């Protein structure tokens, strides 16, 4: 009859709030910290959404003097001995608030400068729904966003420093509750506490945002390959194996709870690339997820000419910023060792080249990761002084990443004309 | 010596120096994480945001946790040991497994208590000595 | 207990785990030394969260000592409290699906883990 104390003593504070907030404030950072690579050292910052929302609101026409901006630009990634970061990740959620926006649009302010791609999680509140499975009922998010409730958020989209935020919907299972039969609590080795039960129904017990395995996918597309063209996808990166899922005896036979917060159907994965949102589907019953768009919450827009509607649509895509960026990681990082040298327009065409160029083809390899070792296609590289400043020079480069895959129509068709030795006149 | 030896008919000296520039190790592509983890509870969370050193977790998430003192002192209903007062949870967090219902029971004095009976009341053998056998 | 501890301890710094220093670096590693092969766990492992840590850093040093950790499971493992009743399951391969397994599933992806070697079933030594 102790077993029925400790079954309400502890189940009174696993309950409590304030206890489990750390849960899934620690839960989701082990999560990211749970592959370990070669060369991949994460770093933690922790801060309440407060003393940023403070932060940037009293800054947002003043980055530069942003404490946060001077502990990522100008304290690590300016500075000479310093090691940059990359990729920075919003453990929180935003909703469609005129605050929350700013919060993006300073981090963003800093992510841009610092090229470092910010991304995060969007909550429920931002579809005006109060639970996220029921985002299922909306047809089409496109005809949504032209509401004039998104108004402000239709600004920001606009904005450039919002090519770099990437905000992920859906919430995977990162926590299953406590049965005796399932995921028992691994007592001690005489205390018997093994039989020990939770409480917990419908859906409210644990959640963790999208956002980390986008990022711990980076991280992976990383120490295999060493850019950041394997994370889209089934086949080539996001796939995302065995995760937490759920299963329950409340009647039947332990009928399986999917471990994604929201099945998200095939049109819904890209009803929402256009939004600017990156779904985190799952696959039903097979316990996984894959991420089949990565895109940032930059305005896809469209134009007459063919060129520049083809322009937006790459600049939209996440994943080649992330590569983008990391030439910025090049230039101001390695070209400083050549800072006094005497150098030419002829040389650091020759520096800068010379290091892109194994990273660039037209050939394709079999495999994707065999292949996603070149992200790039062509590379231009024209640098040139300028009057005046005689030591001083002014490059513009210009990358077309590997074009991937997005979609296709097809019209199936019986043409008995194709053979028309069986069908023609002449027999 | 800069006043260098008096040279002989046949001076050999045998050159050692080598020129050349240093080489670079690489750049271990650094995740910066940003979220409220200490709920304002922890050495770095409690100081100013202009001095918040960044951590590195090069050892791993379980001991870059102990690094900081992360307690807390919240209130929670009381089923154990006698007199009033609701129990207080009070111990400060060393690896990720102390929100496992189970290491609960290890840090929280009072609910010990009934874990230290389940060690010795439960462990009576009443099957050693019911087991006679003349 | 005094290998938990190790392990958990030194997990992200094996080359300083006291075990470590008693196999690799001490008659693998030295000259005169004779190395070793093929060490032999003694113990039954369930599917606990610390238990996984004791074989990802034993393994940590059979991997680099090279020297395939041999173990057994308990049958605590299946979640049954009578090994012979392990007989009714009738495929342990939709029995991993179960997310009751998901920590070990994680563990089956490690390198190291191609290393130890678990055994199923207990001879009467007696």
Same mark, same amino acid.
């Given at each position: 009859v102790?077993?029925?104390?400790?079954?309400?003593?502890?189940?009174?504070?696993?309950?409590?709030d304030?206890?489990?907030?750390?849960?899934?404030?620690?839960?989701?950072?082990?999560?990211?910290?749970?592959?370990?690579?070669?060369?991949?050292?994460?770093?933690?910052?922790?801060?309440?959404?407060?003393?940023?929302?403070?932060?940037?609101?009293?800054?947002?026409?003043?980055?530069?003097?942003? *404490?946060?901006?001077?502990?990522?630009?100008?304290?690590?990634?300016?500075?000479?001995?310093?090691?940059?970061?990359?990729?920075?990740?919003?453990?929180?959620?935003?909703?469609?608030?005129?605050?929350?926006?700013?919060?993006?649009? &300073?981090? &963003?302010?800093?992510?841009?400068?610092?090229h470092?791609?910010?991304?995060?999680?969007?909550?429920?509140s931002?579809?005006?729904?109060?639970?996220?499975?029921?985002?299922?009922?909306?047809?089409?998010?496109?005809?949504?966003?032209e509401?004039?409730?998104?108004?402000?958020?239709?600004?920001?989209?606009?904005?450039?420093?919002?090519?770099?935020?990437?905000?992920?919907?859906?919430?995977?299972?990162?926590?299953?509750?406590?049965?005796?039969?399932?995921?028992?609590?691994?007592?001690?080795?005489?205390?018997?506490?093994?039989?020990?039960?939770?409480?917990?129904?419908?859906?409210?017990?644990?959640?963790?945002?999208?956002?980390?395995?986008?990022?711990?996918?980076?991280?992976?597309?990383?120490?295999?390959?060493?850019?950041?063209?394997?994370?889209?996808?089934?086949?080539?990166?996001?796939?995302?194996?065995?995760?937490?899922?759920?299963?329950?005896?409340?009647?039947?036979?332990?009928?399986?709870?999917?471990?994604?917060?929201?099945?998200?159907? *095939?049109?819904?994965?890209?009803?929402?690339?256009?939004?600017?949102?990156?779904?985190?589907?799952?696959?039903?019953?097979?316990?996984?997820?894959?991420?089949?768009?990565?895109?940032?919450?930059?305005?896809?827009?469209?134009?007459?000419? &063919?060129?520049?509607?083809?322009?937006?649509?790459?600049?939209?895509?996440?994943?080649?910023?992330?590569?983008?960026?990391?030439?910025?990681?090049?230039?101001?990082?390695?070209?400083?060792?050549?800072?006094?040298?005497?150098? *030419?327009?002829?040389?650091?065409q020759?520096?800068?080249?010379?290091?892109?160029?194994?990273?660039?083809?037209?050939?394709?390899?079999?495999?994707?990761?065999?292949?996603?070792?070149?992200?790039?296609?062509?590379?231009?590289?024209?640098?040139?002084?300028?009057?005046?400043?005689?030591?001083?020079?002014?490059?513009?480069?210009?990358?077309?990443?590997h074009?991937?895959?997005?979609?296709?129509?097809?019209?199936?068709?019986?043409?008995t004309r194709?053979?028309?030795?069986?069908?023609?006149?002449?027999? | 010596?800069?006043?260098?030896?008096?040279?002989?008919?046949?001076?050999?000296?045998?050159e050692?120096?080598? *020129?050349?520039?240093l080489?670079?190790?690489?750049?271990?592509?650094?995740?910066?994480?940003?979220?409220?983890?200490?709920? &304002?509870?922890?050495?770095?969370?409690?100081?100013?945001?202009?001095?918040?050193?960044?951590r590195?977790?090069?050892?791993?998430?379980?001991r870059?946790?102990e690094?900081?003192?992360?307690?807390?002192?919240?209130?929670?209903?009381?089923?154990?040991?006698?007199?009033?007062?609701?129990?207080?949870?009070n111990?400060?967090?060393?690896?990720?497994?102390?929100?496992?219902?189970?290491?609960?029971?290890?840090?929280?004095?009072?609910?010990?208590?009934?874990?230290?009976?389940?060690?010795?009341?439960?462990?009576?053998?009443?099957?050693?000595?019911?087991?006679?056998?003349?």
């Amino acid at each position: 009859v102790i077993d029925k104390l400790i079954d309400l003593q502890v189940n009174s504070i696993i309950s409590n709030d304030e206890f489990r907030a750390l849960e899934q404030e620690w839960l989701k950072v082990q999560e990211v910290c749970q592959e370990d690579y070669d060369n991949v050292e994460v770093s933690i910052l922790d801060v309440k959404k407060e003393e940023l929302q403070y932060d940037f609101e009293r800054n947002l026409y003043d980055i530069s003097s942003s *404490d946060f901006f001077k502990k990522v630009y100008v304290s690590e990634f300016d500075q000479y001995g310093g090691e940059p970061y990359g990729a920075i990740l919003g453990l929180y959620n935003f909703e469609n608030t005129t605050n929350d926006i700013i919060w993006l649009t &300073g981090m &963003g302010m800093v992510a841009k400068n610092s090229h470092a791609p910010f991304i995060a999680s969007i909550d429920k509140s931002f579809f005006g729904v109060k639970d996220l499975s029921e985002i299922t009922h909306i047809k089409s998010f496109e005809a949504l966003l032209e509401h004039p409730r998104y108004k402000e958020w239709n600004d920001f989209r606009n904005l450039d420093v919002a090519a770099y935020i990437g905000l992920t919907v859906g919430d995977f299972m990162l926590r299953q509750p406590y049965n005796p039969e399932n995921n028992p609590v691994q007592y001690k080795l005489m205390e018997g506490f093994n039989e020990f039960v939770d409480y917990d129904k419908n859906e409210s017990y644990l959640w963790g945002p999208a956002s980390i395995h986008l990022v711990k996918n980076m991280m992976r597309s990383y120490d295999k390959t060493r850019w950041f063209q394997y994370i889209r996808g089934v086949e080539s990166g996001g796939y995302v194996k065995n995760l937490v899922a759920c299963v329950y005896d409340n009647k039947g036979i332990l009928e399986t709870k999917s471990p994604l917060n929201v099945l998200f159907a *095939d049109y819904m994965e890209l009803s929402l690339a256009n939004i600017g949102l990156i779904p985190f589907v799952s696959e039903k019953g097979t316990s996984n997820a894959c991420f089949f768009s990565v895109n940032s919450a930059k305005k896809v827009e469209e134009f007459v000419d &063919g060129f520049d509607s083809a322009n937006s649509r790459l600049i939209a895509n996440l994943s080649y910023t992330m590569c983008i960026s990391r030439i910025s990681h090049y230039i101001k990082c390695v070209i400083r060792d050549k800072i006094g040298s005497i150098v *030419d327009v002829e040389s650091i065409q020759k520096i800068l080249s010379d290091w892109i160029s194994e990273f660039v083809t037209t050939v394709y390899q079999p495999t994707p990761l065999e292949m996603a070792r070149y992200p790039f296609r062509n590379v231009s590289i024209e640098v040139k002084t300028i009057p005046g400043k005689p030591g001083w020079y002014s490059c513009k480069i210009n990358v077309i990443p590997h074009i991937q895959f997005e979609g296709m129509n097809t019209t199936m068709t019986i043409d008995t004309r194709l053979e028309p030795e069986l069908f023609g006149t002449n027999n | 010596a800069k006043n260098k030896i008096p040279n002989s008919r046949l001076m050999i000296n045998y050159e050692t120096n080598v *020129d050349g520039v240093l080489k670079k190790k690489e750049l271990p592509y650094r995740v910066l994480v940003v979220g409220d983890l200490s709920k &304002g509870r922890s050495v770095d969370a409690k100081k100013e945001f202009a001095d918040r050193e960044v951590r590195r977790v090069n050892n791993g998430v379980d001991r870059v946790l102990e690094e900081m003192n992360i307690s807390f002192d919240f209130e929670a209903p009381n089923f154990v040991s006698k007199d009033p007062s609701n129990l207080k949870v009070n111990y400060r967090i060393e690896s990720v497994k102390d929100f496992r219902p189970d290491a609960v029971a290890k840090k929280v004095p009072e609910i010990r208590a009934l874990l230290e009976m389940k060690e010795i009341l439960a462990s009576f053998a009443k099957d050693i000595e019911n087991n006679r056998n003349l």
